[PDB]
Write a protein that binds this DNA or RNA. Sequence first.
DNA 1: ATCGGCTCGCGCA
DNA 2: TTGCGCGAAGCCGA
Length: 457
Amino acid sequence: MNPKRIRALKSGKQGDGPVVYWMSRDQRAEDNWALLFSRAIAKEANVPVVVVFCLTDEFLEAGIRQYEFMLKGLQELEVSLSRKKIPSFFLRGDPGEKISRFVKDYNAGTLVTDFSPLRIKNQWIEKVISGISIPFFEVDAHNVVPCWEASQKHEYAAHTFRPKLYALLPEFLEEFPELEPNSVTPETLSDVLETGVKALLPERALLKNKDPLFEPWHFEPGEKAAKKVMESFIADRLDSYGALRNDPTKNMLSNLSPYLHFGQISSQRVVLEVEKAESNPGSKKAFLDEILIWKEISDNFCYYNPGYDGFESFPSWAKESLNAHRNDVRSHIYTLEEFEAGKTHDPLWNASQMELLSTGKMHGYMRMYWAKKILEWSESPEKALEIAICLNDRYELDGRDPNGYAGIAWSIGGVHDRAWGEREVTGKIRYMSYEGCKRKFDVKLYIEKYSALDKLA
DNA sequence: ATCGGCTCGCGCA
DNA sequence: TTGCGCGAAGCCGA
Ligand SMILES: Cc1cc2c(cc1C)N(C[C@H](O)[C@H](O)[C@H](O)COP(=O)(O)OP(=O)(O)OC[C@H]1O[C@@H](n3cnc4c(N)ncnc43)[C@H](O)[C@@H]1O)c1[nH]c(=O)[nH]c(=O)c1N2
């Protein structure tokens, strides 16, 4: 293993007890550097490795769609891990409180966790550091190149981040070793799933006839299913990807984001498999740029800008520009609730909101348009930001993610973009138009697909 | 230093 | 639709 993937959070003397991998971002047993590091620490100390996962109350802020997807994955993971004689413990409550107590009760010798740049994880990590006396390590298992190694500062643009990342790819793009089962031999999911579903039922998104909007058959959860999705992408869609990625009437994306978000598949694995596939060099290049440069610069953004979900993290040129247009008359102003229900004047905007409500995965091209029109038809840039984050995290399966905050900040605040022609309301922020979409794809077919969904509560 | 080059709309063929 | 050249625009880094 490359040691630059590990960072020490707290030093100390190893205990005589097991190695505890506090799993949080990377919910998978294969292709997982955090779990492979924990197992190796355990092997040379001659103790078992165990996995712990803390189910927090944050699920109440999203929907059944994300909760079920994640919990069904965990049910499959629990079996996979137990097949390698690795027990998994599912705690309920505040990780700051619960992880400390678990380490004490269970007499852990060493604590390991995976890496996320979101604020709340760093808050928990500092709470855990105060509650423990054993060594504490962090492993970047989500990025190909460890986030603190790729760059030491906020990267202004993809083209400044690209060479830094590619300079390190020969070193860090490598195969994964096998997870060795435990040799030393060492609250109930289903109850948790059923209890949480009952808590969320009053907030389910429903049609007029009381049927749920959400269609759960577009993405089967879990590690096994994720691998099939990757394989059928390489086999059927990667060749057309470069030419058709921006056409929402074609189902030509990898569809991997719900699995990448929950860590049910490793993007390093996807990159390995795509690198070795014989297909169109332009498609491979377009796809590797998205899953390497744009995904990992989103961790760069959140990790070096703690206010990544706020106006104040925009570049100065964009703050100045949007400020100067704060008093311009908006052509329309919608509330959160009229956006949410798809009640704007624009049938193409409404159709993308319908795709979001019913599938939980809006086409990537439409996310740019969707977010830019929220800025255009809301009373202020801060309200636009609020509305865009709220609908993104409530309804996207891949939401509550660095990629989301960075994509919204790109769309509304020009983060990782540049300045364009000055307009009213949106200032110098890059503009997108309904007529622009019409030159690029059959807008009418996309609208027609989602039209019959004004059947809304 | 100093300038080439970055993930839209629109006219046109 | 399809590709191209152009426009308007601020700034990083060889
Ligand atoms: C306003 C807005 C809002 C969001 C996002 C972008 C924008 C403009 N995205 C990013 C992107 O739209 C999304 O990852 C893909 O549409 C996911 O679909 P596929 O995996 O099929 O894409 P596709 O197969 O094209 O891409 C493969 C992977 O590359 C990465 N990638 C692609 N486009 C990216 C982008 N613009 N930024 C960062 N990484 C990118 C993602 O990991 C994606 O899963 C996002 N993504 C996400 O994971 N969670 C979210 O909440 C959102 N929400």
